[PDB]
Design a protein around this ligand. Structure first.
Ligand SMILES: [Cl-]
Ligand SMILES: [Cl-]
Ligand SMILES: [Cl-]
Ligand SMILES: [Cl-]
Ligand SMILES: [Cl-]
Ligand SMILES: [Mg+2]
Ligand SMILES: [Mg+2]
Ligand SMILES: [Mg+2]
Lengths: 144, 143, 145, 144, 144, 144, 144, 53
RNA sequence: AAAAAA
RNA sequence: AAAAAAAA
RNA sequence: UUUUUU
RNA sequence: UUUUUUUU
RNA sequence: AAAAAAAAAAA
RNA sequence: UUUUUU
RNA sequence: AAAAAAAA
RNA sequence: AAAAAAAAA
RNA sequence: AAAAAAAAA
RNA sequence: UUUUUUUU
RNA sequence: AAAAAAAAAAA
RNA sequence: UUUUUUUU
RNA sequence: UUUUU
RNA sequence: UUUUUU
């Protein structure tokens, strides 16, 4: 309600951290080929395009996908996700298909707490299969 | 009361022949592929909106829709980057379509602490889209 | 706290829009008057860039109020009459208000019933004004459309 | 109660009006022929027989009609009313018939608020049709 | 509500009255000479400027007076009222004075129910006195 | 309920009206050119196609308009409306745009009670603009 | 209750019907001979005088009859109604007599919902008998 | 905007004021200007509720 | 609460 | 209690 | 209680 | 309350 | 027990 | 409440 | 909540 | 009914 | 989303 | 609600 | 809260 | 039992 | 109440 | 309830 500056009765110097962690929802795309699985690299989350180039590690919480280009002729779009982990890759293929040809396909998977460790740029996140030549992704992750 | 009735008016009131006006102004802009276009504040001053008599305006929010179809195989999309005289933003508020035949849409609100006047020479925001036009509806206050 | 930065709006379908909306206003303007002579106030005085209304061509008047704008003749108390005029039939009322102090304005006004609130164009007239003061200040509450 | 004059403590000069408005029901008769409609002119309402000769406009609210003379032999009286408006005449025929030959026939119609604009002497109110030679009208209106 | 005409199921022809009564506040002025009383004539109430030229009798209820022009130099406005009755004039002088030389003087008097009989043009209502050359009155009356 | 005809103890002859009013929603289409407004005629409402050829006037209440044909390539349908009145034309351009190129565009406007007078065939309702060569109208009105 | 037009945010194209049904009370008169029964044809309900010339069928609910002309000398008016149906004519003679020679004779009958089918112009509704040469009818029906 | 106030008594002052919303309450230096004033009287008295800092 | 219909 | 005729 | 409007 | 119906 | 009828001049 | 009456 | 300037 | 601005008016 | 901001009674 | 105080 | 005094013209 | 940036 | 959530 | 007064 004050229109003017005021005096803060500051005390002892507080605990500081010039490089906190930040929880994010990173949107990026990946080019997919027909019948070929594409390994999504973690390194794609580290970029000045997301303000995250200052990080080297990230704990992924959940992954969501969307077909980014139209599907072949006569077909309905589809996208699949196989979760990948350093301690052991999964064989799940969380799939989603569009019920309208003109509409995107989508799917996502959540990572359980016991599997939410850090990952670096060299590591992979999951395999993406699709009949569309491009898939949009949105990863909910904790940079640190 | 089906007939005129007398009014017991009193002293002469405080008057103002040129008041303010809260408005939602719809106008379109042309956008080029892979290029950002600065939305000029001047577009809000026009006889088409009854706002030619104004020279300044306080923008409150900005919403955007793609106005033409997207490139073949692509889904529409539109981004908005707020711009201020005291410092431009780097936010890219993006919305995308989920049906190729449908518009993409997104918008942003200006916080009270940044709601200062802007004149015709100023710019509201940068617009990016894969669509050759974008329809903007800006909720603002003319003064 | 309130927001200190820009925030995203999860807009959706393109809304119904209107670039030339209506506007409810209270317009102030004066009219010169002559002694013992009425003056038909033109509706075209409400349309003007001095009121931001030059873009309108019709208007619905709701009420009319009037104040003498200049002093009265020597030894006289100000006064002002209003006779409503309507295209379907002018009125014969003479709503009159007088001043009780020579140095003070005279005032009066009238309300238009809902059934008589149709559009009026510049060529039309609102009401006649009589007064011993040479100029009268009007404040008209009207809906431009 | 008071039996003598008493001093009123008047103050400022009030808002006055020498020519005020008036709500009225005007009784008058119109002359009607067989099979021929008669347009009731609004000018019939302004007259020193009603104290209304000082008005040039009037807002009609409702119209009531009664036959005024005996019907043709072997017939029961009747009367019709077709509202007329400067913005567009109406085609209704609000009719009323007597159930006794010796009794008047009556009918009427109300004008809705959205159609209650002024009218001048040169205007018409409604068409009257009857098998009686004369008709009696009572028009509720607000002179101004 | 209603946007179109609607029928009225009228019955027998009602009692009517084309020349009814009217309760009014009639504003008018009178010229007054210094030191001389002016008998206000009832005829002033009958006039087409008031819509009452169709009446020939009136019952007065109350009379209020205001000075219409400025007072003499150095003096505060004043005005008196002496009621007059055909049955017997009264010797009251209901006097109101102004407290600002620039402001009107005002006063009035009420007529008791027992002294509320008609009056005709030839009659008078009251004597007015004032140091101002004109007096504006507002008489509340029932024309009949 | 009853399986056979029953007697009605009818009384005096009632009030009747062989030509009553009628509240309707009238659908019709108009041709519109590119960049050119089209004044929609009130006469379109009177017609044997709507059972309203017996009416000569109509009190319009609201207007709703949809695009009837596809829009130009790459564009989304739109339709504007400018209310027109005999007492004064409006400058409002109530617009409605589609968000799916395959979907109609729609918009309407309500007429306020104080503007719900009648209109005749000669009169016009509103100006229609659109990028589609044909517009569908649905006018909620009261025929009288 | 505004004072000026507002925008309606219309939606999809609604279901429409340019030629809806109509519930009506159609008044008309039928000429009758003494001692002879007159069949009332249904086609009399279709006519531009009733705004129904666009209907080819109708469902009749009730019938009411009033003698339209005076009776013979020394007699009291009367009227008889005999319902007629395509699936089988009735033999009821619903009758009503005046208790005052100068007063109409009235009677009507209700059609039960199991016998409320459509009737075309060539069909007949009921036979009429009376000692008056004409008879006024008011039929409550549903035009479709 | 032209917030205007007139007097109903010739011998009386004419008055009018305007409030500045929160989103437009920033600092102003000497060179700057507050508002334009138009009056038929040759002088005008101002009372400005401000916050020096 | 609007119009037509015991 | 619905339907029919009657019925203070 | 029904039908158009809503 | 004369004639008909109404899930046993 | 919020404990009888008014009007005229001065609170 | 003072005070002048039916 | 007392005091100061402001303040519907 | 979580992290990164604050843990006390 | 069911209360408020601007102009008006 | 801008500047001061008020028993820890 | 069954939420202030009447009369004149039109319900 | 204050609220504000970003999170499925 | 018009405009704007 | 509309509306015209003390
Ligand atoms: Cl589709
Ligand atoms: Cl398609
Ligand atoms: Cl003074
Ligand atoms: Cl004129
Ligand atoms: Cl209606
Ligand atoms: Mg797809
Ligand atoms: Mg008769
Ligand atoms: Mg008979």
């Amino acid at each position: 309600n004050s229109n003017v500056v005021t005096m803060i009765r500051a005390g002892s110097y507080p605990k500081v951290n010039p490089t906190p962690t930040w929880v994010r929802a990173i949107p990026f795309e990946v080019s997919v080929q027909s019948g070929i699985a594409f390994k999504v690299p973690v390194g794609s989350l580290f970029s000045a395009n997301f303000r995250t180039d200052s990080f080297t590690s990230v704990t992924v919480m959940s992954v969501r996908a969307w077909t980014q280009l139209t599907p072949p002729v006569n077909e309905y779009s589809f996208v699949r996700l196989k979760p990948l982990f350093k301690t052991g890759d999964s064989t799940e293929e969380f799939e989603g298909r569009a019920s309208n040809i003109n509409t995107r396909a989508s799917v996502g998977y959540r990572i359980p707490t016991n599997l939410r460790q850090n990952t670096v740029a060299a590591d992979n996140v999951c395999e993406v299969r699709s009949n569309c030549r491009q898939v949009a992704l949105v990863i909910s992750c904790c940079f640190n």
